[PDB]
Design a protein around this ligand. Structure first.
Ligand SMILES: O=C1CC(c2ccc(Cl)cc2)CC(=O)C1=CO
Length: 133
């Protein structure tokens, strides 16, 4: 029942500061431009202890399946190979990605009828808001 309120089909409706976040992560110019245009659909589902997050866009399709607290390998939309751990902190999904000595955190929370995503790289944050599709 853990993540029930996250389950569903979500579509991006707003983004703020995403180019600067991507720059801070180390994403190159061309990928930033094309990734920044995308309006992804994110499909979140749960089956037993396994959570699946799929993202579909004109840029890239991604899929991760995981168990809370259990590290896994992830290939990100910008083709980083990272080690990821996702936990729940007070109702917020907290997703840490580690690679090349670096780390970034993606937080996902329900707020009103939205799914709010905050991407943090050091001092740089981006907020991405999704609504039900
Ligand atoms: O899981 C993700 C991925 C995240 C992203 C996309 C592209 C790059 Cl280059 C870096 C990070 C954007 C996002 O909104 C999201 C929502 O759950």
């Amino acid at each position: 029942h853990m993540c029930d309120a996250f389950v569903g089909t979500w579509k991006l409706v707003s983004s703020e500061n995403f180019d600067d976040y991507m720059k801070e992560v180390g994403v190159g110019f061309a990928t930033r431009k094309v990734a920044g245009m995308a309006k992804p659909n994110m499909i979140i589902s749960v089956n037993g202890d396994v959570i699946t997050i799929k993202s579909e866009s004109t840029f890239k399709n991604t899929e991760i399946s995981f168990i809370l607290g259990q590290e896994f390998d992830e290939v990100t939309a910008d083709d980083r190979k990272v080690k990821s751990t996702i936990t729940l902190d007070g109702g917020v999904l907290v997703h840490v990605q580690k690679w090349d000595g670096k780390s970034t955190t993606i937080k996902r929370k329900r707020e009103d009828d939205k799914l709010v995503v905050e991407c943090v790289m050091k001092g740089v944050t981006s907020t991405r808001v999704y609504e039900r599709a």
